[PDB]
């Protein structure tokens, strides 16, 4: 469980990246496969959804229909092993995006508070808790592609 | 190839960081040593350059002469092993900088699509593909050092 | 020292994250436990402080009383092993925050230049050197929580 330790770390960094990538590239597959069935994704000011079912439900009915596109930058994944099978973790995340509402470009700073769990040697999200530290629409800036 | 796996991961995260660092700190050495000779660096809206030769050619003739300075923030490196010797990968990258043109401060959000390859136990870039999601000059902000 | 290598890497990424987290979540514990006693934290334009004593002294007497809150995004941690016991490293870091002064929202781009050292199999900061590349107060933006 010292090699095994490094292995878990890897496993989870991919899970964390995959949470983010699956929201930005809107990939249902990637996104649904990271949650244990009793997992809870909570986003402050939205609500709690449970399981991959609920994860996909939030993606399709709230997140994706709210923003033309988003990009989440995830850093500082700081893990703490409670047992070789349960991990808690923080990440700071920066997100840029265009709201459908008013066609607005906005900046979210968030802190994600996580819980990971192993079952049959396989690692998945137990709980993800999103907390928005900053929500700031940018006055005289609109994020656009290079061809406008 | 389970320890060997973690090793490759490390190897590549350094390659990815080195791509970025070598553009921001303008270090020819660091930058030239990460490309296999038949590698292609493609940056949408600029062109494709092949090999370390071409990598250094773009650095000196387009990138560096265009910006007074840049800083690239690289996150979410998500690897997929196709064989113990070929890897595909995404990273989201945030870049801040001053264009020589109009002395403008600008923000690029990019997505990099990568291909890594091992030869004689050593890892290098096979293909890097840059795609700019956001190109936004900032209206009333100029990034400056603290001493202005 | 090939498994041992990957282990050190992990050890330090946590140290690096912990530097940042302990400044943003203002956690004295987390912050004090990462410095060898003869370590130097230098922040250009502020000064040098040495040891955990000095680290906590800067936190409580300069950093924390200057900003209502900060969030540091740390990426590109690029390590170089000088011996299996001394490492040098760069990281690029992005920081957002509200200054108490004028209740201003500002953006710091920094480059951190680090030195790590092992003693009795345990890894700690030897030297951290902060250099601010950008210090830019944002004209018509104030970072706020979502409830304002």
Of A68, A97, A146, nearest to B134 by C-alpha is A146
Query: CATH: 3.30.1330.10, 3.40.50.1360, 2.70.98.40, 3.10.450.50. Which one for C1-138?
Result: 3.10.450.50
Asked how this structure was determined, the answer is X-ray
Spatial contact of B75 and C75, defined as CB atoms under 8 Å apart:
yes
Pairing label, strands A35-43, A122-137: parallel
Pairing label, strands C67-83, C47-50: unpaired
Angstrom distance (rounded) from CA C86 to CA A104: 48
Say which of B78, B134, B138 has its CB closest to residue A96: B134
Angstrom distance (rounded) from CA A48 to CA B146: 43
Angstrom distance (rounded) from CA B66 to CA A39: 48
What does this entry list as its resolution, in Å?
A: 3.5
Exposed (0-12), middle (13-18) or buried (19+): which is B62, by Cβ within 10 Å?
middle
Residue matched to tokens 């005289």: A140
The sign of the torsion formed by the CA atoms of C1, C6, C10, C12 equals positive
Residue of A nearest to B109 (CA): A71
Q: What are the structure tokens assigned to A129, written together?
A: 């808790």
Q: How many CB pairs under 8 A join A and C?
A: 61
Q: What are the structure tokens assigned to C33, written together?
A: 């436990």
Would you give the DSSP letter of residue A103? G
Among residues C4, C14, C18, C24, the one annotated as catalytic is C24
Of A40, A54, A66, nearest to A129 by C-alpha is A40
Angstrom distance (rounded) from CA C109 to CA B143: 9
Domain extent listing, chain B: 1-138
What residues of B are in contact with residue A146 (Cβ under 8 Å)? 44-45, 132, 135
Angstrom distance (rounded) from CA B45 to CA B67: 16
Say which of B9, B76, B138 has its CB closest to residue A20: B76
A145/B135 CB distance under 8 A: yes
What residues of A are in contact with residue C20 (Cβ under 8 Å)? 76, 92
What residues of C are in contact with residue B6 (Cβ under 8 Å)? 6
């Amino acid at each position: 469980s010292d090699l095994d330790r490094l292995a878990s770390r890897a496993a989870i960094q991919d899970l964390y990246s995959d949470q983010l990538i699956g929201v930005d590239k809107r990939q249902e597959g990637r996104l649904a496969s990271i949650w244990w069935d009793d997992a809870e994704w909570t986003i402050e000011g939205i609500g709690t959804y449970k399981g991959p079912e609920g994860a996909l439900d939030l993606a399709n009915n709230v997140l994706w229909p709210m923003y033309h596109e988003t990009i989440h930058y995830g850093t500082n994944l700081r893990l703490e092993f409670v047992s070789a099978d349960k991990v808690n973790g923080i990440g700071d995340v920066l997100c840029l995006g265009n709201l459908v509402e008013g066609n607005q470009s906005i900046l979210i700073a968030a802190v994600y508070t996580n819980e990971y769990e192993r079952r049959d040697g396989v690692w998945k999200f137990s709980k993800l808790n999103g907390c928005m530290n900053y929500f700031t629409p940018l006055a005289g800036i609109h994020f656009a592609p290079p061809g406008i």
